[PDB]
Amino acid sequence: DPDLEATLRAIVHSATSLVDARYGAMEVHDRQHRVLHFVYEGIDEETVRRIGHLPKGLGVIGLLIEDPKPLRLDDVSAHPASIGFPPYHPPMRTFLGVPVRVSFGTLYLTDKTNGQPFSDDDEVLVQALAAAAGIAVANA
Amino acid sequence: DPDLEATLRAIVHSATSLVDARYGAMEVHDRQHRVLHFVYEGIDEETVRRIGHLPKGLGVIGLLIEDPKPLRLDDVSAHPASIGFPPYHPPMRTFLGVPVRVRDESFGTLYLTDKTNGQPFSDDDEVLVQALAAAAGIAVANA
Numbered sequence: 001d002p003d004l005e006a007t008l009r010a011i012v013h014s015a016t017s018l019v020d021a022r023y024g025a026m027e028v029h030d031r032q033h034r035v036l037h038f039v040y041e042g043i044d045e046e047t048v049r050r051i052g053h054l055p056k057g058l059g060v061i062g063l064l065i066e067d068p069k070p071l072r073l074d075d076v077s078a079h080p081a082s083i084g085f086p087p088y089h090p091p092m093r094t095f096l097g098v099p100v101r102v103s104f105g106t107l108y109l110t111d112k113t114n115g116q117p118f119s120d121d122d123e124v125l126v127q128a129l130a131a132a133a134g135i136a137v138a139n140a
Numbered sequence: 141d142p143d144l145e146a147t148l149r150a151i152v153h154s155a156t157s158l159v160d161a162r163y164g165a166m167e168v169h170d171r172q173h174r175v176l177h178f179v180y181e182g183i184d185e186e187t188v189r190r191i192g193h194l195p196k197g198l199g200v201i202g203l204l205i206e207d208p209k210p211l212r213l214d215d216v217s218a219h220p221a222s223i224g225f226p227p228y229h230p231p232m233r234t235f236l237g238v239p240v241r242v243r244d245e246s247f248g249t250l251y252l253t254d255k256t257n258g259q260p261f262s263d264d265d266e267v268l269v270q271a272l273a274a275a276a277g278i279a280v281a282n283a
Protein backbone atom coordinates (compact mmCIF):
# COMPACT_ATOMS: atom_id res chain seq x y z
CA ASP A 1 0.00 0.00 0.00
CA PRO A 2 1.85 3.12 -1.28
CA ASP A 3 -0.13 5.22 1.22
CA LEU A 4 1.07 3.83 4.44
CA GLU A 5 4.63 3.07 3.38
CA ALA A 6 5.36 6.59 2.18
CA THR A 7 4.08 7.74 5.55
CA LEU A 8 5.99 5.08 7.51
CA ARG A 9 9.21 6.00 5.65
CA ALA A 10 8.65 9.68 6.37
CA ILE A 11 8.10 8.88 10.05
CA VAL A 12 11.24 6.72 10.22
CA HIS A 13 13.26 9.45 8.51
CA SER A 14 12.03 12.11 10.92
CA ALA A 15 12.74 9.98 13.97
CA THR A 16 16.23 9.16 12.75
CA SER A 17 17.09 12.75 11.89
CA LEU A 18 15.52 14.22 15.02
CA VAL A 19 17.46 12.05 17.51
CA ASP A 20 20.63 11.89 15.40
CA ALA A 21 20.55 8.10 15.00
CA ARG A 22 22.80 6.62 12.32
CA TYR A 23 20.19 3.92 11.64
CA GLY A 24 16.43 3.72 11.87
CA ALA A 25 13.77 1.12 11.12
CA MET A 26 10.17 0.14 11.58
CA GLU A 27 8.48 -3.23 11.45
CA VAL A 28 4.76 -3.75 11.27
CA HIS A 29 3.32 -7.20 11.98
CA ASP A 30 -0.06 -8.93 12.10
CA ARG A 31 -1.57 -10.43 15.25
CA GLN A 32 0.21 -13.65 14.25
CA HIS A 33 3.44 -11.57 14.67
CA ARG A 34 4.42 -12.10 11.06
CA VAL A 35 6.22 -9.05 9.69
CA LEU A 36 4.06 -7.30 7.07
CA HIS A 37 6.14 -4.17 6.47
CA PHE A 38 9.78 -3.35 7.17
CA VAL A 39 11.09 0.14 6.44
CA TYR A 40 14.66 1.30 7.11
CA GLU A 41 17.06 4.20 6.77
CA GLY A 42 20.82 4.61 6.91
CA ILE A 43 21.88 1.46 5.12
CA ASP A 44 22.75 1.51 1.42
CA GLU A 45 21.41 -0.89 -1.18
CA GLU A 46 24.69 -2.75 -1.62
CA THR A 47 24.73 -3.68 2.09
CA VAL A 48 21.03 -4.62 2.08
CA ARG A 49 21.77 -6.97 -0.81
CA ARG A 50 24.64 -8.55 1.20
CA ILE A 51 22.43 -9.11 4.29
CA GLY A 52 20.07 -10.77 1.88
CA HIS A 53 16.87 -11.33 3.84
CA LEU A 54 14.43 -9.33 5.91
CA PRO A 55 14.25 -9.62 9.68
CA LYS A 56 11.93 -12.38 10.89
CA GLY A 57 11.49 -10.69 14.27
CA LEU A 58 13.95 -12.49 16.50
CA GLY A 59 16.31 -11.51 19.27
CA VAL A 60 15.73 -8.02 20.60
CA ILE A 61 13.40 -7.36 17.63
CA GLY A 62 11.20 -10.28 18.62
CA LEU A 63 11.39 -9.20 22.25
CA LEU A 64 9.71 -5.87 21.44
CA ILE A 65 7.11 -7.69 19.33
CA GLU A 66 6.11 -10.12 22.07
CA ASP A 67 6.37 -7.62 24.89
CA PRO A 68 5.64 -4.22 23.30
CA LYS A 69 7.15 -1.76 25.82
CA PRO A 70 9.75 0.98 25.16
CA LEU A 71 13.38 -0.10 25.51
CA ARG A 72 16.61 1.91 25.56
CA LEU A 73 19.95 0.11 25.66
CA ASP A 74 23.58 1.17 25.87
CA ASP A 75 24.47 -2.02 23.99
CA VAL A 76 21.77 -4.08 22.24
CA SER A 77 24.16 -7.00 21.75
CA ALA A 78 24.58 -7.31 25.52
CA HIS A 79 20.85 -7.83 26.09
CA PRO A 80 20.29 -11.48 27.14
CA ALA A 81 17.59 -11.87 24.45
CA SER A 82 20.01 -10.76 21.73
CA ILE A 83 20.45 -13.25 18.87
CA GLY A 84 23.28 -11.40 17.14
CA PHE A 85 23.50 -9.59 13.81
CA PRO A 86 23.41 -11.70 10.64
CA PRO A 87 26.45 -11.66 8.33
CA TYR A 88 27.04 -8.22 6.64
CA HIS A 89 24.51 -6.53 8.95
CA PRO A 90 26.18 -3.41 10.34
CA PRO A 91 27.10 -3.79 14.00
CA MET A 92 24.99 -1.51 16.18
CA ARG A 93 25.43 -0.58 19.84
CA THR A 94 23.09 2.05 21.32
CA PHE A 95 19.43 1.23 20.86
CA LEU A 96 16.02 2.82 21.24
CA GLY A 97 12.90 0.82 20.47
CA VAL A 98 9.28 1.85 20.98
CA PRO A 99 5.98 0.10 20.15
CA VAL A 100 3.77 1.29 17.31
CA ARG A 101 0.50 1.43 19.23
CA VAL A 102 -3.08 2.76 19.54
CA SER A 103 0.39 -2.76 19.29
CA PHE A 104 1.11 -3.40 15.59
CA GLY A 105 4.83 -2.81 15.26
CA THR A 106 8.06 -1.32 16.46
CA LEU A 107 10.07 1.81 15.67
CA TYR A 108 13.73 1.46 16.44
CA LEU A 109 16.80 3.63 16.20
CA THR A 110 20.47 2.78 16.69
CA ASP A 111 23.91 4.34 17.09
CA LYS A 112 23.22 7.91 18.05
CA THR A 113 26.02 9.67 16.17
CA ASN A 114 27.54 11.33 19.24
CA GLY A 115 28.23 7.84 20.57
CA GLN A 116 26.05 8.51 23.61
CA PRO A 117 23.00 6.58 24.77
CA PHE A 118 19.61 7.81 23.59
CA SER A 119 18.09 10.25 26.07
CA ASP A 120 14.80 10.46 27.92
CA ASP A 121 13.83 13.27 25.55
CA ASP A 122 14.76 11.06 22.59
CA GLU A 123 12.45 8.32 23.84
CA VAL A 124 9.50 10.68 24.43
CA LEU A 125 9.86 12.11 20.89
CA VAL A 126 10.24 8.77 19.13
CA GLN A 127 7.33 7.33 21.13
CA ALA A 128 5.09 10.12 19.82
CA LEU A 129 6.25 9.36 16.30
CA ALA A 130 5.49 5.68 16.82
CA ALA A 131 2.05 6.68 18.11
CA ALA A 132 1.53 8.70 14.93
CA ALA A 133 2.57 5.60 12.96
CA GLY A 134 0.05 3.57 14.97
CA ILE A 135 -2.72 5.87 13.79
CA ALA A 136 -1.59 5.62 10.18
CA VAL A 137 -1.52 1.82 10.23
CA ALA A 138 -4.74 1.47 12.24
CA ASN A 139 -6.52 3.66 9.71
CA ALA A 140 -4.98 2.09 6.59
CA ASP B 141 -17.75 11.90 11.67
CA PRO B 142 -16.85 11.56 15.41
CA ASP B 143 -14.51 8.62 14.76
CA LEU B 144 -12.32 10.58 12.36
CA GLU B 145 -12.45 13.70 14.52
CA ALA B 146 -11.31 11.77 17.62
CA THR B 147 -8.26 10.66 15.68
CA LEU B 148 -7.51 14.14 14.37
CA ARG B 149 -7.87 15.56 17.87
CA ALA B 150 -5.30 13.04 19.18
CA ILE B 151 -2.87 14.07 16.44
CA VAL B 152 -3.42 17.75 17.25
CA HIS B 153 -2.93 17.05 20.94
CA SER B 154 0.35 15.25 20.20
CA ALA B 155 1.64 18.04 17.96
CA THR B 156 0.74 20.68 20.54
CA SER B 157 2.53 18.79 23.33
CA LEU B 158 5.59 17.97 21.24
CA VAL B 159 6.30 21.47 19.91
CA ASP B 160 5.23 23.26 23.13
CA ALA B 161 2.51 25.29 21.39
CA ARG B 162 -0.14 27.16 23.39
CA TYR B 163 -2.74 26.43 20.66
CA GLY B 164 -3.09 23.74 18.00
CA ALA B 165 -5.71 22.99 15.39
CA MET B 166 -6.48 21.06 12.24
CA GLU B 167 -8.94 21.76 9.44
CA VAL B 168 -10.02 19.23 6.81
CA HIS B 169 -11.73 20.49 3.64
CA ASP B 170 -13.31 19.08 0.45
CA ARG B 171 -12.11 19.87 -3.09
CA GLN B 172 -14.25 23.04 -3.06
CA HIS B 173 -12.13 24.01 -0.09
CA ARG B 174 -15.15 23.96 2.20
CA VAL B 175 -14.13 23.14 5.79
CA LEU B 176 -15.60 19.77 6.73
CA HIS B 177 -13.86 19.21 10.06
CA PHE B 178 -12.22 21.54 12.52
CA VAL B 179 -10.56 20.29 15.69
CA TYR B 180 -8.57 22.38 18.16
CA GLU B 181 -6.80 22.47 21.51
CA GLY B 182 -5.98 25.21 24.05
CA ILE B 183 -9.20 27.24 23.84
CA ASP B 184 -12.00 26.59 26.35
CA GLU B 185 -15.65 26.11 25.47
CA GLU B 186 -16.87 29.48 26.79
CA THR B 187 -14.38 31.28 24.52
CA VAL B 188 -15.33 29.11 21.53
CA ARG B 189 -18.98 30.02 22.10
CA ARG B 190 -18.01 33.69 22.21
CA ILE B 191 -16.08 33.40 18.91
CA GLY B 192 -19.39 32.00 17.72
CA HIS B 193 -18.56 30.54 14.33
CA LEU B 194 -16.15 28.02 12.85
CA PRO B 195 -13.31 29.09 10.54
CA LYS B 196 -14.34 29.23 6.91
CA GLY B 197 -10.74 28.99 5.69
CA LEU B 198 -9.78 32.64 5.13
CA GLY B 199 -6.68 34.74 5.83
CA VAL B 200 -3.60 32.69 6.74
CA ILE B 201 -5.79 29.57 7.22
CA GLY B 202 -7.00 29.95 3.65
CA LEU B 203 -3.45 30.62 2.50
CA LEU B 204 -2.38 27.13 3.61
CA ILE B 205 -5.43 25.55 1.99
CA GLU B 206 -4.88 27.41 -1.26
CA ASP B 207 -1.10 26.89 -1.26
CA PRO B 208 -0.41 23.73 0.74
CA LYS B 209 3.26 24.26 1.73
CA PRO B 210 4.80 24.28 5.22
CA LEU B 211 4.85 27.79 6.68
CA ARG B 212 6.43 29.32 9.78
CA LEU B 213 5.83 32.96 10.78
CA ASP B 214 7.12 35.08 13.71
CA ASP B 215 3.87 37.04 13.68
CA VAL B 216 0.92 35.63 11.80
CA SER B 217 -0.92 38.96 11.71
CA ALA B 218 1.91 40.51 9.68
CA HIS B 219 1.52 38.11 6.73
CA PRO B 220 0.11 39.94 3.73
CA ALA B 221 -2.69 37.32 3.47
CA SER B 222 -3.75 37.87 7.11
CA ILE B 223 -7.41 38.82 7.63
CA GLY B 224 -7.25 39.40 11.39
CA PHE B 225 -8.72 37.40 14.28
CA PRO B 226 -12.49 37.45 14.85
CA PRO B 227 -13.89 38.90 18.10
CA TYR B 228 -12.95 36.83 21.21
CA HIS B 229 -10.43 34.76 19.22
CA PRO B 230 -7.25 34.70 21.33
CA PRO B 231 -4.51 36.79 19.73
CA MET B 232 -1.74 34.57 18.38
CA ARG B 233 1.72 35.46 17.13
CA THR B 234 4.19 32.67 16.31
CA PHE B 235 2.81 30.25 13.77
CA LEU B 236 3.58 26.83 12.29
CA GLY B 237 1.35 25.40 9.57
CA VAL B 238 1.77 22.18 7.57
CA PRO B 239 -0.50 20.51 4.99
CA VAL B 240 -2.33 17.30 5.77
CA ARG B 241 -1.57 15.54 2.55
CA VAL B 242 -1.36 12.13 1.01
CA ARG B 243 -0.30 12.26 -2.67
CA ASP B 244 -2.28 13.97 -5.44
CA GLU B 245 -4.46 15.52 -2.75
CA SER B 246 -4.06 17.87 0.18
CA PHE B 247 -7.13 17.63 2.46
CA GLY B 248 -6.20 19.86 5.36
CA THR B 249 -3.80 21.77 7.51
CA LEU B 250 -2.26 21.23 10.92
CA TYR B 251 -1.37 24.48 12.64
CA LEU B 252 0.28 25.50 15.88
CA THR B 253 0.69 28.92 17.42
CA ASP B 254 2.37 30.68 20.35
CA LYS B 255 5.19 28.32 21.24
CA THR B 256 5.31 28.66 25.04
CA ASN B 257 8.94 29.71 25.32
CA GLY B 258 8.04 32.89 23.44
CA GLN B 259 10.29 31.81 20.57
CA PRO B 260 9.52 31.07 16.89
CA PHE B 261 8.86 27.43 15.94
CA SER B 262 12.05 25.55 14.97
CA ASP B 263 13.20 23.51 11.97
CA ASP B 264 12.83 20.47 14.23
CA ASP B 265 9.28 21.54 15.16
CA GLU B 266 8.31 21.59 11.48
CA VAL B 267 9.87 18.18 10.70
CA LEU B 268 7.98 16.70 13.62
CA VAL B 269 4.58 18.25 12.78
CA GLN B 270 5.03 17.15 9.14
CA ALA B 271 5.31 13.54 10.23
CA LEU B 272 2.16 13.77 12.35
CA ALA B 273 0.35 15.53 9.52
CA ALA B 274 1.24 12.61 7.24
CA ALA B 275 -0.31 10.20 9.73
CA ALA B 276 -3.46 12.40 9.73
CA GLY B 277 -3.51 12.28 5.94
CA ILE B 278 -3.89 8.52 6.05
CA ALA B 279 -6.75 8.76 8.52
CA VAL B 280 -8.47 11.36 6.33
CA ALA B 281 -7.81 9.54 3.06
CA ASN B 282 -9.24 6.32 4.49
CA ALA B 283 -12.37 7.77 6.15
Ligand code: HEM
Binds near residue numbers: 049057089109
Ligand atom coordinates in the same frame (compact mmCIF):
# COMPACT_ATOMS: atom_id res chain seq x y z
C1 HEM C 1 18.87 0.31 9.06
C2 HEM C 1 18.10 0.13 10.15
C3 HEM C 1 18.24 -1.17 10.97
C4 HEM C 1 18.20 -1.27 12.32
C5 HEM C 1 18.09 -0.09 13.32
C6 HEM C 1 18.35 -2.67 12.69
C7 HEM C 1 18.40 -3.26 13.96
C8 HEM C 1 18.67 -4.58 14.30
C9 HEM C 1 19.13 -5.09 15.59
C10 HEM C 1 19.43 -4.20 16.82
C11 HEM C 1 19.26 -6.42 15.51
C12 HEM C 1 19.79 -7.32 16.66
C13 HEM C 1 18.75 -8.25 17.22
C14 HEM C 1 19.43 -9.09 18.28
O1 HEM C 1 20.70 -9.18 18.36
O2 HEM C 1 18.65 -9.69 19.04
C15 HEM C 1 18.89 -6.85 14.17
C16 HEM C 1 18.86 -8.13 13.63
C17 HEM C 1 18.56 -8.51 12.33
N1 HEM C 1 18.46 -7.68 11.24
FE1 HEM C 1 18.42 -5.49 11.36
N2 HEM C 1 18.44 -3.35 11.50
C18 HEM C 1 18.35 -2.51 10.41
C19 HEM C 1 18.39 -2.90 9.08
C20 HEM C 1 18.25 -4.15 8.52
C21 HEM C 1 18.11 -4.54 7.12
C22 HEM C 1 18.09 -3.50 5.97
C23 HEM C 1 17.98 -5.90 7.06
C24 HEM C 1 17.80 -6.85 5.84
C25 HEM C 1 17.77 -6.46 4.56
C26 HEM C 1 18.06 -6.41 8.41
C27 HEM C 1 18.01 -7.73 8.81
C28 HEM C 1 18.17 -8.32 10.04
C29 HEM C 1 18.05 -9.73 10.34
C30 HEM C 1 17.74 -10.90 9.38
C31 HEM C 1 18.30 -9.84 11.85
C32 HEM C 1 18.28 -11.15 12.68
C33 HEM C 1 17.06 -11.08 13.60
C34 HEM C 1 15.75 -11.22 12.86
O3 HEM C 1 15.69 -11.91 11.80
O4 HEM C 1 14.75 -10.62 13.32
N3 HEM C 1 18.22 -5.32 9.22
N4 HEM C 1 18.56 -5.70 13.50
Ligand code: HEM
Binds near residue numbers: 183199216217229252
Ligand atom coordinates in the same frame (compact mmCIF):
# COMPACT_ATOMS: atom_id res chain seq x y z
C1 HEM D 1 -6.99 26.56 19.14
C2 HEM D 1 -6.32 26.51 17.98
C3 HEM D 1 -6.50 27.65 16.96
C4 HEM D 1 -5.51 28.14 16.18
C5 HEM D 1 -4.03 27.68 16.19
C6 HEM D 1 -6.06 29.19 15.36
C7 HEM D 1 -5.39 29.99 14.43
C8 HEM D 1 -5.89 30.94 13.55
C9 HEM D 1 -5.17 31.68 12.53
C10 HEM D 1 -3.65 31.53 12.28
C11 HEM D 1 -6.03 32.49 11.86
C12 HEM D 1 -5.71 33.46 10.69
C13 HEM D 1 -5.56 34.87 11.25
C14 HEM D 1 -5.40 35.90 10.13
O1 HEM D 1 -5.53 35.57 8.93
O2 HEM D 1 -5.16 37.08 10.48
C15 HEM D 1 -7.35 32.30 12.44
C16 HEM D 1 -8.55 32.90 12.07
C17 HEM D 1 -9.86 32.51 12.36
N1 HEM D 1 -10.25 31.66 13.39
FE1 HEM D 1 -8.84 30.39 14.54
N2 HEM D 1 -7.39 29.25 15.69
C18 HEM D 1 -7.75 28.33 16.64
C19 HEM D 1 -9.03 28.17 17.18
C20 HEM D 1 -10.25 28.63 16.69
C21 HEM D 1 -11.59 28.28 17.12
C22 HEM D 1 -11.87 27.28 18.28
C23 HEM D 1 -12.49 28.98 16.36
C24 HEM D 1 -14.03 28.97 16.38
C25 HEM D 1 -14.71 27.91 16.82
C26 HEM D 1 -11.75 29.78 15.40
C27 HEM D 1 -12.26 30.64 14.43
C28 HEM D 1 -11.61 31.43 13.49
C29 HEM D 1 -12.23 32.21 12.45
C30 HEM D 1 -13.74 32.30 12.13
C31 HEM D 1 -11.08 32.91 11.69
C32 HEM D 1 -11.22 33.84 10.48
C33 HEM D 1 -10.65 33.12 9.26
C34 HEM D 1 -11.56 32.01 8.77
O3 HEM D 1 -12.81 32.13 8.87
O4 HEM D 1 -11.02 30.99 8.29
N3 HEM D 1 -10.44 29.51 15.67
N4 HEM D 1 -7.19 31.38 13.44
